[PDB]
Symmetry: D2
Subunit: 455 residues, 4 copies
């Protein structure tokens, strides 16, 4: 049901076990914003699963063999051949992380006035697309926008919406389809192989490109393995390779499913696009032979991507997240459903139904969680959504959530219990959670440095 860790602990990270009264003082000095907390003051840090992973002994051995050459590094060649073998693409261009690849992709594939259609969007990626003159069109299935609906493969593209876009704007006016795995804005929801294939088939008929934003493609492959009929005798590597056989290229954040602390890459099949990518990469990242990465990180990412294909590893990764969500759900705590590959999202609108969205229920719940347990979580609600600079009004997102984001191979089920038990205890007296108000609000990037006090 829940497997034990399919690894041993090789080394540990020292933590301060500061008690409740001291955590409250830290939380106050941070202005009740978990983004302002010092890492040294946090027991369990679930701010993000990006770049926070534990590497293996084998990756650390790789880190000692960094070949730091500007061109022709053995580490580059190892990353290159690993990604060619596992993802099946012709050309690989390393980037320092995922958004560096997206910056390149947008410049390579978008003419101004064109549409980019995808299964929801990621803030930075959408910025790059719009900066290049594209209009983003969301073609995810309707169910994805219903955070309570417990159904499989909620990340799937609605083929009818894609069909309508093609009919209305013309294929030649579509830059590409951006297919994300898993889908962030729906809570880490997977995409079925059936959907990927149907998308390939429709787009190919019209000459439209498909590029994958593949940041959690291994979590995705695990869901296919577990839940899509016909995949029960297939290895994770076999599923991953098939997934990408339905794309023209991809952007990858090594920092997520490649089990590293930094790293990414851009893949493609097209020789002309590759030629062009080589010129752009130099401008923003570095030579095509390192792409803004140390040789030791190309090595660590080549090693980690291969480790990610081990069935027992990814099964455990996803079931650990699931354990946390199952324990919360069994106690009545409201969460986004189904639980995603990388995180559990608390529904803070429902958890704190006595608070208005203007009193920042997600921000306040995240503060309470830290004070009660030493666990840091991320506000993913009204604060992060930011203000409308035209009107001065909050953007008021339908999702008012606290994200419990789980780094790979860092925490145990007992840490998941610390998280769950603390949240369950807060839920039992949820009416006591106080609202927040700004005492300092930056004009930009307000989630990162805003400060609050209790109402």
């Amino acid at each position: 049901n829940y497997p034990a860790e399919p690894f041993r602990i090789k080394s540990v990270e020292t933590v301060s076990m500061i008690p409740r009264d001291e955590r409250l003082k830290k939380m106050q000095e941070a202005g009740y914003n978990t983004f302002l907390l010092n890492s040294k003051d946090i027991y369990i840090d679930l701010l993000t699963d990006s770049g926070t992973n534990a590497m293996s002994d084998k990756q650390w051995a790789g880190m000692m063999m960094g070949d730091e050459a500007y061109a022709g590094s053995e580490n580059f060649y190892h990353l290159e051949r690993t990604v060619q073998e596992l993802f099946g693409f012709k050309h690989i261009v390393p980037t320092h992380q995922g958004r560096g690849a997206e910056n390149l992709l947008s410049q390579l594939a978008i003419k101004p006035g064109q549409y980019v259609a995808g299964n929801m969007y990621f803030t930075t990626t959408r910025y790059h697309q719009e900066k290049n003159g594209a209009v983003f069109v969301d073609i995810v299935r309707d169910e994805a926008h219903d955070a309570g609906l417990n159904i499989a493969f909620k990340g799937d593209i609605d083929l009818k919406k894609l069909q309508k876009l093609i009919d209305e704007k013309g294929a030649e006016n579509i830059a590409y389809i951006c297919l994300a795995v898993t889908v962030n804005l729906a809570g880490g929801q997977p995409v079925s192989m059936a959907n990927m294939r149907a998308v390939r088939e429709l787009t190919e008929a019209h000459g439209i490109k498909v590029f994958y934003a593949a940041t959690r493609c291994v979590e995705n492959a695990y869901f296919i393995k577990e839940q899509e009929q016909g995949f029960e005798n297939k290895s994770i590597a076999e599923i991953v390779h098939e997934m990408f056989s339905y794309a023209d290229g991809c952007t990858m954040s090594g920092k997520k499913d490649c089990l590293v602390n930094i790293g990414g890459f851009l893949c493609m099949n097209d020789d002309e696009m590759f030629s062009s990518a080589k010129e752009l990469v130099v401008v923003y990242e570095g030579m095509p032979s390192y792409g803004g990465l140390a040789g030791r990180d190309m090595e660590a990412m080549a090693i980690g991507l291969r480790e990610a294909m081990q069935y027992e590893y990814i099964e455990h990764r996803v079931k650990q997240v699931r354990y946390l969500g199952d324990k919360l759900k069994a106690a009545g705590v409201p969460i986004v459903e189904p639980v995603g590959g990388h995180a559990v999202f608390l529904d803070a609108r429902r958890f704190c139904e006595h608070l208005t969205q203007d009193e920042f229920p997600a921000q306040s719940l995240a503060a309470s969680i830290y004070v009660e347990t030493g666990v840091r979580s991320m506000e993913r609600g009204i604060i992060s959504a930011g203000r409308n600079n035209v009107t001065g009004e909050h953007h008021r997102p339908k999702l008012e959530t606290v994200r419990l984001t789980i780094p790979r191979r860092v925490y145990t089920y007992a840490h998941m219990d610390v998280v769950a038990d603390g949240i369950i205890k807060l839920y039992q007296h949820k009416e006591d959670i106080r609202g927040l108000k700004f005492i300092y609000e930056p004009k930009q990037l307000r989630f990162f440095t805003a400060r609050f006090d209790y109402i």
Copy 2:
């Protein structure tokens, strides 16, 4: 009652997740002796807690700062001042591990024909003592020999036995008292501060020296803090320092409670002893300034000893072992009680009541455990006890046990569940466990390479 790990995972060790049928084949190739298994074939290796610990990030940082100089190394100065501060002895001599320190002590403190008395013995230490012409006398309380008996501080010395020795032999004929913390042969049982005090008082009145075999002294300090009334307001460090204030020196295995993979030391207060120690260490270990250790290992051990003093670390260490024993006990599995600081010992006599000791129930239980779970454990019974050289018969120890020895900071509670669940399942069909017989018996060190088959 079971705390979460008070640390995060920094790096992981890759393990083979081989299935049962393949484990059976490995166990057979190892002639059903867990000592012959390949490390690469083992999921959870509970052969020993000695030298198998996960280091922290801070120790690994120290490992990069190895000052490898033959004399005057910063790492030696760091180790020296750390031991002086935390153990309180005037002089420190590094050794490659504990038995190197015991080798020196035996040569420095024993005249031919004297007695060494202690709370049970460690095999290699008794060897050194006798090689220097001492007779060993066991002065442990009788309860220590009763595996099933659940009493606190089972490792305590019987002061009446001590008194009897003094009266029968004379004080001038006792080289020293060797007080071990914790006590191996009783299953990792602790010694109280009251006993250490009373032993010191009686010996000092007679001019008899006391040396500690301090290999799990921090586990011991934890039992004092948790269970000895009057110690509830003391830090682990205050307890450790007080323990050593009742001794003239110690031998230490850093491989156990200093959280390293290699290292030990000898401490004393006496200047003349220290001078003679310097001459001896050179011949067996290395110069007094490194003692058969790399500079980086003196550094790791200096760091590790200070980390061991953190309450939450040692509370978790001991309660994790306790969890494994509690879960086994709740299912009716016979174990040595109370659970020790470092291991749970299955009582194979009671587990396999249908087998005679001559059929090697501990060896066979250890084999079945590996086959069912991927867990390696150590035979600590008739096989390890070896053969009588005069009579040709087995030494037949009273305790016939399988030792589930827990490395520090390597495993989680979910690993403990893997161990417990597999042993509980075996216990539910205990009658099916088959006796073993030798098919190859070496003349010396037989537990290491002997091979068996089922009767």
Copy 3:
């Protein structure tokens, strides 16, 4: 005049010691382009000093203490306070390397149609400037363009050129002065404190901002200490701090003078600029708290920058490069003069007077060097200058050089002898060096993958 290395070797990098005949075959497989050689096939790799530095034991210890948190990392706090202390700017924004910082600066400080004036340019930086709609104006002193001329502080700005710009265009039409230390295109030539002061005085009177492209600022500080009268009693740190006191901010490549393999940052004093910078960094690099770097790399760079301030380190760094140039000069080998902080540039025009620039003397000299010595160097001539897109003709740069670029702390004087002796032997038979012609020319970034054969 040449000091010994002010450090010891902690660890070594394994290299191939392949003989001449095998090097010839590698060079041929690389189509006589050193950019295509495999790192594993190179004994001494002088392609670049960027990112190829040997770190110390103390940096590697810092690498073990990577605090990988998305915000609030101890490593970010260490980098931030180190830069504030040593460079003296209010605000620091990490970037994955220098061109990431330049990308942000160009977007923050340039309005369409303004001029950026500087002492020559770096290709990628000029690209960003022009992409933001600036026209670049070179205000370097004329001597900087005269490769053979041996004068001090060749990188200095011509203040009369600056004055002319201000009078012809108006101050409101100058976005900023970009002052580079040291100056790449003049061969690593330094800028005096007097010039930095005079530039600041003139610009400040007109309300024009100054930003430093500070990639080899510590090499530059060394030239000031050694050669600018009045600086003989100042530490390298005092010099660096004073240099930056004449600027409104900087872009930094830690990959050069901060002694690391990856990393950079952007600094500024202005609060509004810092706020806008935070929004931009997120889209291109990462959160302002890591900027596209692992925590361990922020830590290494923080450590490396402080190590760079040690006089003996930077004295040795620069005098080791000088030794290679002095030895070449003493044999009559034509080089750019004075020798720069980081590289010796062979003047391939003078080396191969029997070849026309259209026969690619620098490319061919670089090839022969590898074949004769196992040493890789970079073509910095007509090939790297690329092709005119309008006319289809080569850009024909005045300087046609081979760059012998020296990574910090990687090589010894005996390696420099290997380099010099092989080049002196080639020079003794310079007439034998054959012209090259393309057999494959890419349309973009041609120096990276172009292939040649002998005419």
Copy 4:
């Protein structure tokens, strides 16, 4: 003539570049005993070549893959098969370093009253032999005792002396021949393959065992390669394998020619001796599967022994030592000749001919060297020889030397120049070097902690 380093520097060790006046104060605080200096205060530490070597990137990768299992570690298996392949022995028993192997060997191979004959002796080894009741007989050729005689293979055994021993005491009374490579007491002098073979042939005829004390066997193999006719087409590995084909076993210090900071082993062919060794190793070192070493050190030593076979590495190692000796000799500085594989010995009796041996010319010269250059060297003269405890008189050795002992891969030719130039300058005013007298003399191990002041 002198090759460049056949490696690059991967990482560096930070040094204090304290000037002359500060070094003098340090030297004073150390009581003019270089053994008392702090490592942090030394620029170039030539105290010993034992355990001070720089490891490769590949060895450091190995260090990250330590398999710390008590038995069946992959690292043990790698060391085992590497030594079997390269040295040709059947059985390998790791030990923490060389003297641990010697302790075992003496107990395994000596009956009381027997003779051990060798080519000179090593202090700790002779202690082990005598402790087991053997009498040591020196059978080195006469020339070895003439430190000025410039001849090849000065370490050779005199077959006539071995013949005489056999005739006089009987073969059955000879425990074994201990053949050392290279020979320490003669200044690091090699043994020819011809001599090894002649020794094997004579001993085999009489049934006498031969064991090699093989600590610098790779330096030895390089001398055979360079100077013994018939070995010019043989690889270093081929010579090493042949050397050991003439022994029954060996003791090895990894700390010298295996390029590690700790580690050693005992080898043998005999099954019964191996069985016995297994019992003893447990008592003094650890299980036969780790022998007092961390798994990562067995791995580092397995890797390093293989790296030591590279021709260019060992050629450079030996020629660097030679460069130092050649430079000294060319200036008239008196040294032991020929220069050995690992060190240059200054003849301090000749260097300081105005001082009596009672004024400690070697100790004083070593102090002067440190003050003038920051270089630490070892006294190998009257101080180290110690006192006769029966008579109270100094042992007065024929060799009164300062040992300039060179760690492998740590220093450059420029460091060798710092050493040489300083010594050459001291030589030019040698009459000014003052004698020393004790102000504090320990009863034991006096070289390690004695303190002096100037006469």
